[PDB]
Design a binder for this molecule. Sequence first.
Ligand SMILES: *[C@@H]1O[C@H](CO[C@@H]2O[C@@H](C)[C@@H](O)[C@@H](O)[C@@H]2O)[C@@H](O[C@@H]2O[C@H](CO)[C@@H](O[C@@H]3O[C@H](CO)[C@@H](O)[C@H](O)[C@@H]3O)[C@H](O)[C@H]2NC(C)=O)[C@H](O)[C@H]1NC(C)=O
Ligand SMILES: *[C@@H]1O[C@H](CO[C@@H]2O[C@@H](C)[C@@H](O)[C@@H](O)[C@@H]2O)[C@@H](O[C@@H]2O[C@H](CO)[C@@H](O[C@@H]3O[C@H](CO)[C@@H](O)[C@H](O)[C@@H]3O)[C@H](O)[C@H]2NC(C)=O)[C@H](O)[C@H]1NC(C)=O
Ligand SMILES: *[C@@H]1O[C@H](CO)[C@@H](O[C@@H]2O[C@H](CO)[C@@H](O[C@@H]3O[C@H](CO)[C@@H](O)[C@H](O)[C@H]3NC(C)=O)[C@H](O)[C@H]2NC(C)=O)[C@H](O)[C@H]1NC(C)=O
Ligand SMILES: *[C@@H]1O[C@H](CO)[C@@H](O[C@@H]2O[C@H](CO)[C@@H](O[C@@H]3O[C@H](CO)[C@@H](O)[C@H](O)[C@H]3NC(C)=O)[C@H](O)[C@H]2NC(C)=O)[C@H](O)[C@H]1NC(C)=O
Ligand SMILES: *[C@@H]1O[C@H](CO)[C@@H](O[C@@H]2O[C@H](CO)[C@@H](O)[C@H](O)[C@H]2NC(C)=O)[C@H](O)[C@H]1NC(C)=O
Ligand SMILES: *[C@@H]1O[C@H](CO)[C@@H](O[C@@H]2O[C@H](CO)[C@@H](O)[C@H](O)[C@H]2NC(C)=O)[C@H](O)[C@H]1NC(C)=O
Ligand SMILES: *[C@@H]1O[C@H](CO)[C@@H](O[C@@H]2O[C@H](CO)[C@@H](O)[C@H](O)[C@H]2NC(C)=O)[C@H](O)[C@H]1NC(C)=O
Ligand SMILES: *[C@@H]1O[C@H](CO)[C@@H](O[C@@H]2O[C@H](CO)[C@@H](O)[C@H](O)[C@H]2NC(C)=O)[C@H](O)[C@H]1NC(C)=O
Ligand SMILES: O=C(CCN(Cc1ccc2c(c1)OCO2)Cc1ccc2c(c1)OCO2)NO
Ligand SMILES: O=C(CCN(Cc1ccc2c(c1)OCO2)Cc1ccc2c(c1)OCO2)NO
Ligand SMILES: *[C@@H]1O[C@H](CO)[C@@H](O)[C@H](O)[C@H]1NC(C)=O
Ligand SMILES: *[C@@H]1O[C@H](CO)[C@@H](O)[C@H](O)[C@H]1NC(C)=O
Ligand SMILES: [Ca+2]
Ligand SMILES: [Ca+2]
Ligand SMILES: [Ca+2]
Ligand SMILES: [Ca+2]
Ligand SMILES: [Zn+2]
Ligand SMILES: [Zn+2]
Lengths: 535, 535
Amino acid sequence: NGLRDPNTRWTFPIPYILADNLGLNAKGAILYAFEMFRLKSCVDFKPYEGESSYIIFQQFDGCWSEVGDQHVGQNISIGQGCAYKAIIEHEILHALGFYHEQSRTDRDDYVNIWWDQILSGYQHNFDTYDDSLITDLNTPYDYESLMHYQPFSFNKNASVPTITAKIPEFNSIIGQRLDFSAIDLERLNRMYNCTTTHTLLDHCTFEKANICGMIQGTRDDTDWAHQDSAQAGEVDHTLLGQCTGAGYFMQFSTSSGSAEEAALLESRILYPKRKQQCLQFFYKMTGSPSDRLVVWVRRDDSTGNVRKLVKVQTFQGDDDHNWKIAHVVLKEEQKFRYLFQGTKGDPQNSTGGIYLDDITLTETPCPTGVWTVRNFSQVLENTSKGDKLQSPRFYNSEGYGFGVTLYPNSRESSGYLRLAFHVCSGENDAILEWPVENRQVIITILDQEPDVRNRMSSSMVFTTSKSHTSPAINDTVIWDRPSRVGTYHTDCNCFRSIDLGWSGFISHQMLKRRSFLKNDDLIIFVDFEDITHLS
Amino acid sequence: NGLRDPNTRWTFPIPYILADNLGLNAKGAILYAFEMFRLKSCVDFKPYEGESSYIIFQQFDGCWSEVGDQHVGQNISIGQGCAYKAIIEHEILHALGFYHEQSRTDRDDYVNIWWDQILSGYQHNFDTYDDSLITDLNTPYDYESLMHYQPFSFNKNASVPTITAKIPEFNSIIGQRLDFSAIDLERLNRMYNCTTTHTLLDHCTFEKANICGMIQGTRDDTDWAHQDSAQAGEVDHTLLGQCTGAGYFMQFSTSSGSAEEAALLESRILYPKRKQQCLQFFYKMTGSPSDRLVVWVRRDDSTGNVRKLVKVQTFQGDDDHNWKIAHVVLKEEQKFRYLFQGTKGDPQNSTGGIYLDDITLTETPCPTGVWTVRNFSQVLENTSKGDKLQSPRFYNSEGYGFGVTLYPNSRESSGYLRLAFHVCSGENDAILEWPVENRQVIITILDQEPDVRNRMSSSMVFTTSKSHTSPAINDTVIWDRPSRVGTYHTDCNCFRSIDLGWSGFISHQMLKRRSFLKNDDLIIFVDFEDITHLS
Ligand SMILES: *[C@@H]1O[C@H](CO[C@@H]2O[C@@H](C)[C@@H](O)[C@@H](O)[C@@H]2O)[C@@H](O[C@@H]2O[C@H](CO)[C@@H](O[C@@H]3O[C@H](CO)[C@@H](O)[C@H](O)[C@@H]3O)[C@H](O)[C@H]2NC(C)=O)[C@H](O)[C@H]1NC(C)=O
Ligand SMILES: *[C@@H]1O[C@H](CO[C@@H]2O[C@@H](C)[C@@H](O)[C@@H](O)[C@@H]2O)[C@@H](O[C@@H]2O[C@H](CO)[C@@H](O[C@@H]3O[C@H](CO)[C@@H](O)[C@H](O)[C@@H]3O)[C@H](O)[C@H]2NC(C)=O)[C@H](O)[C@H]1NC(C)=O
Ligand SMILES: *[C@@H]1O[C@H](CO)[C@@H](O[C@@H]2O[C@H](CO)[C@@H](O[C@@H]3O[C@H](CO)[C@@H](O)[C@H](O)[C@H]3NC(C)=O)[C@H](O)[C@H]2NC(C)=O)[C@H](O)[C@H]1NC(C)=O
Ligand SMILES: *[C@@H]1O[C@H](CO)[C@@H](O[C@@H]2O[C@H](CO)[C@@H](O[C@@H]3O[C@H](CO)[C@@H](O)[C@H](O)[C@H]3NC(C)=O)[C@H](O)[C@H]2NC(C)=O)[C@H](O)[C@H]1NC(C)=O
Ligand SMILES: *[C@@H]1O[C@H](CO)[C@@H](O[C@@H]2O[C@H](CO)[C@@H](O)[C@H](O)[C@H]2NC(C)=O)[C@H](O)[C@H]1NC(C)=O
Ligand SMILES: *[C@@H]1O[C@H](CO)[C@@H](O[C@@H]2O[C@H](CO)[C@@H](O)[C@H](O)[C@H]2NC(C)=O)[C@H](O)[C@H]1NC(C)=O
Ligand SMILES: *[C@@H]1O[C@H](CO)[C@@H](O[C@@H]2O[C@H](CO)[C@@H](O)[C@H](O)[C@H]2NC(C)=O)[C@H](O)[C@H]1NC(C)=O
Ligand SMILES: *[C@@H]1O[C@H](CO)[C@@H](O[C@@H]2O[C@H](CO)[C@@H](O)[C@H](O)[C@H]2NC(C)=O)[C@H](O)[C@H]1NC(C)=O
Ligand SMILES: O=C(CCN(Cc1ccc2c(c1)OCO2)Cc1ccc2c(c1)OCO2)NO
Ligand SMILES: O=C(CCN(Cc1ccc2c(c1)OCO2)Cc1ccc2c(c1)OCO2)NO
Ligand SMILES: *[C@@H]1O[C@H](CO)[C@@H](O)[C@H](O)[C@H]1NC(C)=O
Ligand SMILES: *[C@@H]1O[C@H](CO)[C@@H](O)[C@H](O)[C@H]1NC(C)=O
Ligand SMILES: [Ca+2]
Ligand SMILES: [Ca+2]
Ligand SMILES: [Ca+2]
Ligand SMILES: [Ca+2]
Ligand SMILES: [Zn+2]
Ligand SMILES: [Zn+2]
């Protein structure tokens, strides 16, 4: 579905203008979509400074783009209801040179188009282009493509689909709104000659014997073991015992020796392109309550020698002995290495140790809040319609308290999950501005792959506004101070606001595809950040 | 280990000269190494026609290259004993811009260098270069790299290594001479922006529900099932039951219905860049001896419409019900689709059917002769030192008969497999030239991966010669007519020549690694072809 003519190709970075007919929410959503391109490809964007060809993003009727570089500069429309990552990415893929997936030359082998069912003037979105106009880039037809329409697209009648797969199982798959597929990224790479990405700096799952170039020092008293997953209660996070002889983790045993004995595991040297990085990893702590996993940096001392130590974060064990997710903010601007120190506490009171798998390092912020809901498939059967779970309280960089409400069985949309966001009372509220407005909320359900290019995380975005009001609170703004608009909870000693978000955030059937529930548990990320400076 | 300065980079195709001080064997081995680059990368080579920078390949003392593009033209030496794929690939990687892996800036974290062991004048091969000269290309240190030296490299004393890994397990792994590693290909792609490759056209393992864009028509009688491997006593070829819920194959059952019922499985449309292609796949036929698996092409009829049928090959079931390898020559010069017809014969005498997995399509010749040795671990135990196996007799394009001899436990080299080539008598010998004067032999042990970029197949090359002579045949040429120089065999009614080959073709420990013995069986490819046209 890519345009064949090479003169229609861009030169990176693509220069852009955000028009003031976009709201703050759309400007913020566009910049968030640009970060996804940098993370997963070599595509890049710059602010406009008088270039010949450029993209101007505007609010017009509907959501549309031209296809390929129009050398005089060109519109992308992002209308009302289109300020979502997946829709921005689809329009940027039009501008990069891609038609819809149902517009492929071979599409009649894979789908039916019901021309009698398409609304007036939308039928060109269903045209098929010839092999002189469009390339396949030597890739198959992708039902999971972000460029593929959903069955009920521009239909006259809500009961009758416009597009259907010839094999009926794919009617549950076509028109995904998660992210780029693996074939969408492979096409993007083949068109623009990408190999690296601007923002994926490292990842490690420990499956090869060389453990991603990680090394073990001698200043420590002991070593980490590269451990095989071939024992009854010891399986790695990458495969969860799916695959014999094929899933590895690192282990540090704490059941023997002196207390305060330690081992260091240390990365290969890394060259950061930005000033901030997020280190994500998975771990278990089954040993003593006095064991300690400590994350460190070793950085250039300014001579070119990577030897300056800096401690970044400590982790300690509770009664939960399953796999946990960690995020560490690193702030490196010169070459450095990431380090894990496992430490024994009270070996005479330990029957276990420390475990590591699935490390990822990105040149991005870390998520502000992270929530893990355990045994989520059992919760999904034990919870009645409209019964709910609530997250622990999180604090943002500005000091505002917030949380998320999860309704596993939504009353408002049968067979869907409902995620809503609320503000929480917190220790700072007395000095913060109220109502909290112009703050973008990004909620993501994590697709648990260690390589970011494989991930299709579901994400939803809104911005806090004076227009958000409820009859339950005498028609006042939902985002006013939680002690006056919220309701008290013994679970956190909080007042929690009325909760805004999406009934129909994700389908239960979608939640059973990919890695949304990898170890029977659901991981949700939340960011809450001021975008007033984009106005 | 790559050179950082972008002015040292080549423009493709790299112009080359093969100098006439190279023998035929060396010229033929260089052209074979270029095919391996075109198969695994976007690197390309052209004959010289008056360009400014070019590579001239010559026979001088030792085997060496300059590093990066030298803009006035440069030598590669290929000396005596260096006419080997892996050695030629190593020199071409120097010209493309790579130093040895032990020359990385971080190398001291992974290896010990024993300077007092290095023979005089060779020590610069063991130098380490700074991060201003060289890039890591954001890659870990690779023990399995083609650019890494073996332990006994340029050593003064035959018992003492020059280089050792700091972790002793890798002393058995460093200095591999198979092929490019996965990291060496990743470095080459990052340096030159390769995404596609010139010669891999398709591959399919059937692991996704999309089945690599394969389609099933309705002009046939029935369909191929996409089958789950979750049935006892039946699994797929890709994973062989290693991995729960994972491994898929196509299945066509023949145990019910009418005879002559059929199913078509049909590829996506393909645009060949060359005039000849090879379709490799794996299959089983557990049904009736009257079942057929038939390979077809559907090709562009010159209107742009892919509707023209050509039958290419037929396969039928003997008493072996394990996975078999198959190769089909295709000669497509316009867009086409490759097709599998499964056909039922005698469903009242079938308890099984036809199975497909692991399809690969490349713009190459097919191998001239293919040998599968079954139960190879049990053969390797049950065969005494110097006892031998012999292949069926193959025929080349010119009509010469040939075969191979395998000595599973080599007497000459303990812990190695010895593999050798011989000329067989055959139906054409009366009109062929004798002795063989200039035919290159290529022998390959297949690393069984369906994606060619993941293979590290072991290969050896030599050219038949007037200098190959034996005391067993009164100092006459080994390659003279097999009825006058060979011994009669009841196994094929042939005369087989004296064999020539390599004691130490591969170690037993190397053979029990990667995918050389995937289903407890060994696959050997052989090619035997004239290179006199290079003189
Ligand atoms: C020894 O370690 C145990 C926990 O360690 C576990 O048992 C060992 C024998 C080994 O098998 C280890 O591999 C294994 O992980 C400690 O017991 C824990 O003590 C803490 C602190 O008192 C308890 O936390 C409390 O839990 C109560 C509710 O039960 C809360 O009300 C408190 O607020 C607090 O959170 C924890 O529950 C308890 N866990 C268990 C499994 O008993 C033990 O204290 C320690 N002893 C010494 C001498 O260090
Ligand atoms: C019916 O099919 C069998 C083989 O098919 C197998 O058995 C069926 C009942 C089903 O369970 C199938 O799923 C299963 O695959 C035929 O038997 C085979 O016949 C061939 C040809 O005669 C035999 O080959 C010969 O073998 C002898 C030595 O035994 C050699 O000397 C010959 O040169 C030749 O190679 C083969 O051994 C035999 N195999 C078996 C399993 O008995 C059978 O002929 C066929 N009958 C009909 C009605 O077509
Ligand atoms: C991704 O890499 C591709 C190569 O793998 C690039 O494709 C090449 O673009 C070259 C121009 O930049 C082409 O050279 C031109 O070829 C035409 C005939 O097609 C000649 O008339 C021109 O004179 C010639 N120009 C030059 C400067 O030599 C290559 O032919 C072409 N190669 C292939 C295989 O298509 C892509 O441009 C590049 N894409 C991006 C967007 O980076
Ligand atoms: C793969 O694509 C890369 C771009 O994504 C290429 O990297 C670019 O190489 C250019 C040279 O070919 C560089 O231009 C040079 O920049 C230096 C300063 O760094 C200037 O002094 C030079 O004058 C300038 N030369 C030219 C001809 O303009 C680009 O800066 C550089 N870009 C990046 C992002 O690194 C790779 O070369 C390319 N690799 C291959 C061989 O395919
Ligand atoms: C985006 O579309 C707008 C129209 O919605 C384009 O604006 C027009 O520009 C032409 C040529 O200058 C004028 O004749 C029209 O009067 C303009 N219309 C309006 C309503 O402004 C705009 O040029 C497009 N942007 C780009 C750069 O493609
Ligand atoms: C959309 O299509 C449905 C299905 O064809 C229509 O429902 C039918 O309505 C007619 C009367 O107009 C009834 O006689 C049928 O029994 C209905 N069928 C079903 C299955 O409900 C519906 O009227 C159409 N709506 C629109 C917008 O035209
Ligand atoms: C590459 O090899 C050729 C052939 O040996 C070199 O050409 C001559 O080499 C000899 C021995 O070094 C010199 O004495 C001659 O003066 C060389 N003649 C020339 C300049 O053509 C050639 O110098 C070698 N070097 C490269 C990289 O071209
Ligand atoms: C290579 O090194 C080996 C091992 O050091 C040498 O063998 C030793 O030879 C000395 C006499 O020179 C004996 O005293 C030792 O007992 C030998 N040791 C072993 C383990 O055999 C060998 O001589 C060296 N050869 C060369 C080429 O110098
Ligand atoms: O065709 C269009 C329309 C934009 N959009 C297409 C689309 C977007 C993401 C996809 C996808 C298809 O399949 C995979 O993920 C559908 C759409 C969404 C919300 C809307 C709306 C239209 O109208 C206002 O609110 N322009 O390109
Ligand atoms: O360093 C050199 C020397 C060439 N060669 C290096 C080498 C080649 C392939 C490799 C490898 C190392 O590690 C992975 O695979 C070793 C060599 C082989 C045969 C010879 C010989 C030298 O002398 C004559 O016969 N030039 O670059
Ligand atoms: C999940 O269920 C298991 C029992 O199957 C239980 O041991 C574990 O504590 C549960 N986890 C949570 C907190 O849901
Ligand atoms: C391999 O051994 C099996 C028995 O385990 C036997 O059935 C099969 O025929 C053998 N294959 C060959 C030809 O080596
Ligand atoms: Ca792992
Ligand atoms: Ca240590
Ligand atoms: Ca059919
Ligand atoms: Ca398979
Ligand atoms: Zn679109
Ligand atoms: Zn070398």
